[PDB]
Curated annotation (Swiss-Prot):
GO terms for biological process: apoptotic process; B cell receptor signaling pathway; Bergmann glial cell differentiation; cardiac neural crest cell development involved in heart development; caveolin-mediated endocytosis; cell surface receptor signaling pathway; cellular response to amino acid starvation; cellular response to tumor necrosis factor. Changing P313R: In NS13; results in increased MAPK signaling; increased translocation to the nucleus; reduced interaction with DUSP6; no effect on interaction with MAP2K1. It is found in: Cytoplasm, Cytoskeleton, Spindle; Nucleus; Cytoplasm, Cytoskeleton, Microtubule organizing center, Centrosome; Cytoplasm. The modification Phosphoserine is found at S19, S236, S238, S274. This is Mitogen-activated protein kinase 1. It is linked to Noonan syndrome 13: A form of Noonan syndrome, a disease characterized by short stature, facial dysmorphic features such as hypertelorism, a downward eyeslant and low-set posteriorly rotated ears, and a high incidence of congenital heart defects and hypertrophic cardiomyopathy. Other features can include a short neck with webbing or redundancy of skin, deafness, motor delay, variable intellectual deficits, multiple skeletal defects, cryptorchidism, and bleeding diathesis. GO terms for molecular function: ATP binding; DNA binding; identical protein binding; MAP kinase activity; phosphatase binding; phosphotyrosine residue binding; protein serine kinase activity; protein serine/threonine kinase activity. Residues 249-267 bind DNA.
Amino acid sequence: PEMVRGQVFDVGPRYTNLSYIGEGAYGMVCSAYDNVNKVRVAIKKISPFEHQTYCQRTLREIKILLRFRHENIIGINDIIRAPTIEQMKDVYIVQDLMETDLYKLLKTQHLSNDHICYFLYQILRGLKYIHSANVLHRDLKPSNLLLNTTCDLKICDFGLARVADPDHDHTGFLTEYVATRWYRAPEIMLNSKGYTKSIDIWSVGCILAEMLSNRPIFPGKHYLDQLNHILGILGSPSQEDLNCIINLKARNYLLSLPHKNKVPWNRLFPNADSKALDLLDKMLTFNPHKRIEVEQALAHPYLEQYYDPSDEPIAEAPFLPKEKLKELIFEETARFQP
Ligand SMILES: CC(=O)NCc1ccc2[nH]ncc2c1
């Protein structure tokens, strides 16, 4: 039984020569030589079985990623676990090894306009597929966008994903939310559960802005401070957009704020391509009903050199206590067993 950083990393004889990568949500991450395909691979250890939430998220991701097949979405290549429920304490998910991710790249590398364009294209191409399956990722951020040595990009981490449910999207003001703060659309803090596709487009807009400067655009330090970062750049919502927020606590909060003017994108991003800023503006639209959709974003002039809807595939179809969820993780991973 191989050990890494003083813990069992029990990946069998198939996978050998482990090197520590980093530290996931529910366990450790390593590379390993795959003795069957003769390539190094990434493997993450997942120990979710005590907690119903870690079980829920583990199972959501497994079910989604096994059903999806797309060049810009990470696959599951193998899953390692014990032969019986009783002996299964952990699950190992094997995926393609990727050199880096966008978070690491942004902290260390200047991106050319050509790189930004290509990364954005790949993100949206992957997102077209996800949305075509009626699924929302709900936690798009640089550290969930993996890149290889030739800058192929794959979206990962579907633990917070949901089926879209726009008829149940409304909630009150200051309703708590789980997904990463800096990439949360303004409506999350006002009146949205994050059950519509527009939530993901906002996050992509934040990612685009961060590619342009290497700095997150709206780095809020706490729940409501996130909204006030957004409003500091977008400025005060218009009457029409304010009138769409029927909830009085949310509406009156916005009305209580002093008038803020829009910060022009070309002053925030003086070296950016003008077509990139036109698309950014459309993704970072305050009103989620007016926000650009994924397929429109692909068709935007900024992406013209890549846009090819015949080569931007869609999914073939649309997509509980911890004891039942352990059984379900066991069943879902059975296809990888001898
Ligand atoms: C967000 C996440 O789950 N990161 C860990 C991870 C997953 C797959 C990976 N492939 N290559 C490297 C690598 C890292």
